[PDB]
């Protein structure tokens, strides 16, 4: 006479293997994945404002390449550069290209304010057939090619004060010709010089004459430089030749803006975390998609799978 009372736990037919401190593989009833290893392959247009350059790099839209004149006065939270982007204007080079790209991307705006620079004794709006705007020649929309007027090239001394409550970004350039004939024909003097200066900074460039490889029909170059003028300071331009003059300034901003190289398409969805492989969910703590991220993203790790146990040890029959 009597009864038996047994204590026990549950089990499952198919368990899950997980790692522990002691055992490399141990079977539990259930587990969950902590590493996001897949992406949809499309960048969601929300909540972050995405601006696709299509066939334009950021520097081209900044300078004003003709086929990039659609991104004027534009803003963005993430600018996406494609691999198909091309340059279709005057052959140029930017010493410290990465820094200018980074600062413009972190600013997050291409808002351009035009200023009435006073150019006394020079021909304005010079162009070239390698940078066609419409059927005829053209040039960078935010730059002005100053050349000879009459037969003399005056020593230009122009000033522009910063009386606003925000920083100003000025993009200017120096023209490097291919032969002394071109130099003397366009800028009279045999050797030019450009000096862009503030109260605490100076930048003097001497043009260099020589034949470069043929790019879009030209063996001449343009060197692009930038200058930031703070409130209360003054920009001074002193040039005796080969000046690619600015037309105004860019309003510098500070925020959460950035840039990303990616070839994934842009879709209408919502996702906080974007990678070059596409948008990924932010519910898991880690991710193995790409080390390049933007937004509220899981932390990148080398492991493709990490399973966290959500149940007890699975001891079947």
């Amino acid at each position: 006479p009597g009864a038996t009372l047994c204590l026990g736990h549950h089990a499952v037919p198919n368990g899950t293997l997980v790692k522990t401190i002691t055992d490399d593989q141990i079977e539990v009833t259930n587990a969950t994945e902590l590493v996001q290893s897949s992406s949809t392959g499309k960048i969601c247009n929300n909540p972050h404002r995405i601006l696709d350059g299509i066939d334009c790099t950021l520097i081209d839209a900044l300078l004003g390449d003709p086929h990039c004149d659609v991104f004027q006065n534009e803003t963005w939270d993430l600018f996406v550069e494609r691999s198909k982007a091309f340059s279709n204007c005057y052959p140029y080079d930017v010493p410290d290209y990465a820094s200018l790209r980074s600062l413009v991307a972190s600013s997050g705006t291409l808002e351009f304010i035009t200023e009435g620079f006073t150019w006394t004794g020079v021909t304005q709006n010079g162009g070239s057939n390698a940078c066609k705007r419409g059927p005829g020649s053209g040039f960078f929309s935010r730059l002005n090619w100053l050349t000879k007027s009459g037969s003399t090239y005056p020593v230009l001394n122009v000033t522009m004060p910063n009386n606003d409550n925000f920083d100003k970004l000025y993009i200017w350039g120096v023209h490097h010709p291919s032969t002394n004939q071109e130099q003397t024909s366009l800028y009279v003097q045999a050797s030019g010089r450009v000096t862009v200066s503030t109260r605490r900074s100076q930048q003097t460039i001497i043009p260099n004459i020589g034949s470069r490889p043929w790019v879009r029909g030209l063996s001449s170059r343009i060197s692009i430089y930038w200058t930031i003028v703070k409130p209360g300071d003054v920009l001074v331009i002193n040039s005796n030749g080969n000046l690619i003059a600015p037309r105004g300034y860019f309003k510098m901003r500070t925020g959460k803006s950035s840039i990303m190289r990616s070839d994934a398409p842009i879709d209408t969805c919502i996702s906080e975390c974007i990678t070059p492989n596409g948008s990924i969910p932010n519910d898991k703590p880690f991710q193995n998609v790409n080390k390049i991220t933007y937004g509220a993203c899981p932390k990148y790790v080398k492991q493709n799978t990490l399973k966290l146990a959500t149940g007890m040890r699975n001891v079947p029959e």
């Binding site: 969950t32 519910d283 898991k284 959500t310």
Partner: protein, 57 residues
């Protein structure tokens, strides 16, 4: 009684998980509840669990 109390505390925790943005834990608790609900006996818990499941994705 006891079963109802277990599922009700579970529903409270699911509601908190939904109201905190943690989706993995909400899914964990929802799956466990979807296996503990005595079908034909607690339709109110089933309906409230479906409602909390909607507020997730």
């Amino acid at each position: 009684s006891q079963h109802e109390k277990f599922l009700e505390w579970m529903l409270r925790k699911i509601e908190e998980a939904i109201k905190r943005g943690n989706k993995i834990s909400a899914e964990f608790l929802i799956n466990l509840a979807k296996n503990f609900i005595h079908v034909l006996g607690d339709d109110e818990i089933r309906r409230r669990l479906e409602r909390l499941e909607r507020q997730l994705h």
